[PDB]
Amino acid sequence: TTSTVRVGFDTPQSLSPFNALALPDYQTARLSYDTLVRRDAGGVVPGLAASWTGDAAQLTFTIRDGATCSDGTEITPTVVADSLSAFAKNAGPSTVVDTFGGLNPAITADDAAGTVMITPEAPWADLLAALSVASTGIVCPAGLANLDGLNTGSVEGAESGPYVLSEVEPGVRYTYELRDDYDSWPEWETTLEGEIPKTIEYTVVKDPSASANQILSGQLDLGRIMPDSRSRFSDSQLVSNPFGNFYLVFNEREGAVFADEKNREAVAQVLDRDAFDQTTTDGTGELTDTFGSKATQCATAAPRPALTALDESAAAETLAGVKIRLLGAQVVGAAGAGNTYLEAALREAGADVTLENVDIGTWAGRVFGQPESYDLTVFPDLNFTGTLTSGISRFTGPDLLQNGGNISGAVSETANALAQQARTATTPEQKCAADAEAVAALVAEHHTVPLLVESFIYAKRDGFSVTMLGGSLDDHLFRIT
Numbered sequence: 288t289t290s291t292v293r294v295g296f297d298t299p300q301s302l303s304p305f306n307a308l309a310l311p312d313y314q315t316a317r318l319s320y321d322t323l324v325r326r327d328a329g330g331v332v333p334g335l336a337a338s339w340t341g342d343a344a345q346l347t348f349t350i351r352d353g354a355t356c357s358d359g360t361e362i363t364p365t366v367v368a369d370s371l372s373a374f375a376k377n378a379g380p381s382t383v384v385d386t387f388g389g390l391n392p393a394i395t396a397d398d399a400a401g402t403v404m405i406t407p408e409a410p411w412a413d414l415l416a417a418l419s420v421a422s423t424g425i426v427c428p429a430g431l432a433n434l435d436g437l438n439t440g441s442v443e444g445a446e447s448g449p450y451v452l453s454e455v456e457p458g459v460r461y462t463y464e465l466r467d468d469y470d471s472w473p474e475w476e477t478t479l480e481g482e483i484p485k486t487i488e489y490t491v492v493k494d495p496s497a498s499a500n501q502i503l504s505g506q507l508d509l510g511r512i513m514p515d516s517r518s519r520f521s522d523s524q525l526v527s528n529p530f531g532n533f534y535l536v537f538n539e540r541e542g543a544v545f546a547d548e549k550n551r552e553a554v555a556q557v558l559d560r561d562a563f564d565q566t567t568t569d570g571t572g573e574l575t576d577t578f579g580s581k582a583t584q585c586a587t588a589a590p591r592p593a594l595t596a597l598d599e600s601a602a603a604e605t606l607a608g609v610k611i612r613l614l615g616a617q618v619v620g621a622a623g624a625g626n627t628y629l630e631a632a633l634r635e636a637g638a639d640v641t642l643e644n645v646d647i648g649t650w651a652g653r654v655f656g657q658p659e660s661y662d663l664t665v666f667p668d669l670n671f672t673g674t675l676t677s678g679i680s681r682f683t684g685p686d687l688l689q690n691g692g693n694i695s696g697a698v699s700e701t702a703n704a705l706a707q708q709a710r711t712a713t714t715p716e717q718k719c720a721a722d723a724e725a726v727a728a729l730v731a732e733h734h735t736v737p738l739l740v741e742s743f744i745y746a747k748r749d750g751f752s753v754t755m756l757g758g759s760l761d762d763h764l765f766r767i768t
């Protein structure tokens with residue numbers, strides 16, 4: 288009969304919702320701050336917002352009663368509108384356009400009406416879903432006063448969420464303590480067996496072998512496992528959820544090697560999606576030819592992209608002596624094994640390849656902070672909105688360098704146009720038609736290769752559960768049995 292759960296996870300690159308880029312950022316943001324809506328089967332359930340009304344042009348949220356910060360401040364529309372305003376101006380340009388379709392939403396409170404009104408500068412369907420993501424969590428006025436404070440840990444009175452980070456050992460352990468004065472839980476349709484933990488010790492594991500060993504020796508209760516480690520556990524200690532959707536991102540900027548489309552195609556010709564799946568997921572994942580799974584909106588709509596066939600001969604002629612800075616996330620298979628496979632397939636095509644296999648936190652700083660610092664990566668996307676928009680955004684609009692969402696610096700006139708008619712779309716069908724065509728275009732012009740959807744495998748000790756509701760990625764519901 289304990290009240291403490293010890294969860295394995297990767298090192299955060301920030302504890303501030305505004306600077307969140309990597310899963311560990313969202314995992315911590317999830318405990319400390321409440322979002323307006325939360326994920327569940329068939330869509331989104333009321334969280335800090337009791338209900339909402341609106342289109343893709345504009346949503347109005349009505350804030351719930353009895354909602355309160357870790358200092359006591361009543362959570363009013365002014366607090367919420369201030370938090371979402373602070374987010375829109377302080378967060379990464381990437382995550383802001385992903386949320387509001389742009390950098391300049393209209394956000395306004397009305398403490399009388401009890402409403403918060405958001406008005407995308409152009410219509411944005413992804414807004415409602417985007418506000419279920421941990422990084423949109425409400426920062427109370429204590430947090431807005433000190434943004435440098437939120438990066439590194441708890442600023443007193445900032446938390447809108449059920450926990451406060453009471454103890455910190457940077458890059459080692461983040462100890463979260465449940466607060467006595469919180470009953471503002473979301474309106475979950477789903478019913479969860481077991482007790483909300485009083486104390487959550489978010490424990491940094493350096494690698495998957497370590498993760499497994501510490502479940503098994505009882506240093507951890509819950510932790511992520513690499514597919515090879517499955518056989519070490521009974522089926523009943525495992526909880527398997529579809530997670531990241533993996534696709535290539537090239538540095539396409541004028542002067543870089545993958546500016547030239549003929550180089551991008553050569554990479555496509557050298558990557559066996561079967562071999563890549565075997566090395567990355569060992570068949571626990573699923574191939575996908577788009578920016579999601581079959582559960583992703585529009586992901587089965589026409590057309591299906593025409594992937595480049597393997598041509599290792601044609602790739603050898605093209606990539607001979609070509610210098611490729613391959614950036615790797617260590618989540619892309621055990622210890623970044625998928626990145627290793629990709630390097631190896633480029634090496635045997637005669638490319639001069641240098642792979643940097645880094646932790647998810649370091650990877651995320653590099654991709655979103657210094658986009659010119661690499662040529663190619665396997666991008667493990669977290670499709671938070673459950674649409675194809677997540678992935679299309681990464682290749683269209685203004686560059687990241689110009690405060691856009693365009694990670695790769697790719698200029699696809701077709702894909703850019705199809706992104707815009709997705710916004711002007713009268714019906715869901717036209718929207719899907721636009722989105723599916725945008726992905727097909729991007730695949731045809733060798734702007735990406737869609738790879739797979741991975742499985743997030745939690746291994747857990749007796750007495751401990753963990754649930755992911757409505758295809759959620761950053762809302763791991765820990766329970767003590």
Ligand SMILES: CCCOC(=O)c1ccc(O)cc1
Pocket residue numbers: 308309310311530531618647651666667668669741743
């Ligand atoms: C896509 C944004 C950063 O990605 C992650 O933090 C991530 C993605 C997939 C995973 O399985 C783990 C982390």
